[PDB]
Amino acid sequence: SAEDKAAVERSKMNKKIEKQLQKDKQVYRATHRLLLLGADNSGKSTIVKQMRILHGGSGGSGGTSGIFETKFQVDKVNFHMFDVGAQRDERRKWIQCFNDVTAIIFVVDSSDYNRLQEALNLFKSIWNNRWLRTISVILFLNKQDLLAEKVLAGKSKIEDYFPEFARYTTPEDATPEPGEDPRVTRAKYFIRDEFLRISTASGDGRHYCYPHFTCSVDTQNVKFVFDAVTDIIIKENLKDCGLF
Amino acid sequence: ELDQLRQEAEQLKNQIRDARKACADATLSQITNNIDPVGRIQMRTRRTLRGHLAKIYAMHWGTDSRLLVSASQDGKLIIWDSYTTNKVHAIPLRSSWVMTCAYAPSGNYVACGGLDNICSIYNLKTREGNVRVSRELAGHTGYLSCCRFLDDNQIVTSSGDTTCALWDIETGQQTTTFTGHTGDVMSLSLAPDTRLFVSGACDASAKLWDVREGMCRQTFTGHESDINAICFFPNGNAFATGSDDATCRLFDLRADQELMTYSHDNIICGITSVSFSKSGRLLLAGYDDFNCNVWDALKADRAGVLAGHDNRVSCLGVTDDGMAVATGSWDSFLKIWN
Amino acid sequence: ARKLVEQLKMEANIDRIKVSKAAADLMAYCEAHAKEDPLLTPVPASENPF
């Protein structure tokens, strides 16, 4: 069968295709995929700049473009990161595509907004979503420079619309930075615990929430994501072995 | 004026419902209660296609009933010879998040798209030995959900912006834009005369569209949840929809009302994909439970199962001669059933 | 809402055949092509590729 077996466009060429698929299986396994989520006022558009140590520019948002694939690496481990772009608020549809991901990163302006309650309703929707049941959430309480300024200035209003802050008190879990005020520490940990109160209520060991505190300029977001995927991956390998 | 408009709309809806009820005189099941059932369809996996790195999300047949295209969330758009089970092309996509692909009727071009909102056109017949993007279509807002060539120059699409649009490939400018869905549009099918298309959306509605006119002819709201899947009946006068409510409804355009419903009490999962076989008697649907149920279209009964995937059957389709079914799945295989 | 009412009026003005006639036509078409269907009547050893 010379017309079926030839090397230019027939079955021997159709074997040379599998060399590329064998070389490409490898990069798809090696790279980690990270869905990026949160509100309009979230600062995640600043976070992707903190993620980028690439000298070459990357095409993100551009007119009606629908997803902002972004690339970075830590310790020679590659990360592909996806801020979902120009899309509607019907997220139960486009979220099905992300059943594959290594983790979600959920980014919140932790900055004493009334809208913090919408971020809590969204995290409750996302944490419990039927497509996301195995997918860990890394959680960024962002802009806590602004939280510190607002609370230190005494112009914070958190009890006035979260009517349990006055009853809540700082847990022995709390490890604050040197010189942080008792009100600032109580406020950041209360906002942290309000998310953990959603995450522990149904996080029965399928998936884990990794809360972090972060600001408009810190360099440690790339490391926080590297450290947290390293915990997620080792948990997945222990489960693959049936050893956990 | 708003109250008057609402009253007029309610009156029009009531009149349409009354007309549909009057047109209803005998149910399809009662009329078809005398024809013998198809019996238990048994299918076997004649071939398995292996090489996608990730979740297969769409597939389409070439018109020859032998070439097959499939798309996967790794961003590969593989073309397979079905008969020999080997890879004719392995087109690398510019976007990983490919929710749809299409085969041109002439087999010269393939389309695909997804969360990038761009419908890329790839030309298979080129002087050089490597495939290249003939044209990139932009203008849709939100994800591209389904796409289908009408010819080598006209391609129709649906999207997250709740629109469908007709694109002229050569010029790259929309020829007509079809709007009226409130929800995101999830799927398309083109009537066999290539004169109409039907689309289903997250608002649970289906709409029929006149392509030479740019206007909606009929609307249906039988489903109570978001419609994922839609396909045309071979006769072209009816279509079947697939929603997360674990039910399929067949609508007759001439009757402008539902005729039969396909659902089982043992199914508590949504439907990903639907297609008819060539005669239209046998309906095939993919489900979230990891298998595809066959059905009799003319008699609601789950008359067979295609089972063997480790994960969600995301896509399926029947060849133009009826001599295979393919199903793709989130376990990165395609199985050919015959 | 002008477009919606116009579409409804256009759809209403259409000739609809009897449902029984449509069912009879479908049955006749199925009977005519009943033997030509590969799935409905399995072919004996005629599956050249499958």
Place this chain on the structure above:
Amino acid sequence: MGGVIKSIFTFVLIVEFIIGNLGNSFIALVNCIDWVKGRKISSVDRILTALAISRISLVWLIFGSWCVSVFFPALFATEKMFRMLTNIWTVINHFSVWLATGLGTFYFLKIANFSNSIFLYLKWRVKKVVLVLLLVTSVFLFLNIALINIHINASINGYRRFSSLIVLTSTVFIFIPFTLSLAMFLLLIFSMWKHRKKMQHTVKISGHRGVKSVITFFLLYAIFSLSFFISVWTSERLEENLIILSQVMGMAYPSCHSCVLILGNKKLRQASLSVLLWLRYMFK
């Protein structure tokens, strides 16, 4: 003093036989049941069931040897049996020990992380690595067979038992995979401890639980290493009734290590608890 020692050795050998038989049979039966009723099995499950099959083969062989030594011992005294039984035993034991070593390699690769490129290559080629390791180790089996056969032939020629040196050779060729397994387990424990130290500093505690099972394998390693250390000393130190001593000693690993797999592995632990609760329920 000989009679009481012999009776105690026989009783401990009997309990070892029954416990190993029931444990390996339970592992194999649960794996086969989960295979039959859907439940797509993992690679670890396949390795575990193969190990259980090898261990049941070994325990049956050893128990048959004991029965032949008890019933009509005249057959056991024959040189032909002395050669054939030891050859089959060494083949089966080599395969079982290297299958266990392959399981250990599979865990070390699949779970651990290091920055060394060689480790990453072996990590992402794990499935082919273990199979090649099992296949390439056949050279050790052939060399062991040749050495034991030539040694026994020379002993018989000199005679026309001298097990003090055959047991030494068996111990020497058994320590080889055991040392590698020991080194790999210690490397994985170092990796898990570094991982958790790094996790406890930067990441808060609210954010590697496998260390809950590591205690049953450290207990096993310590028990079997002490017994093996006593083995070499006893091979030349004193006494001459080594036949029963060796026969009981060689069955400890396949008889007890399986229970350590049962408690260490989630699937087997859950199966054991289900069996216990079913036994309780049927009691009524």
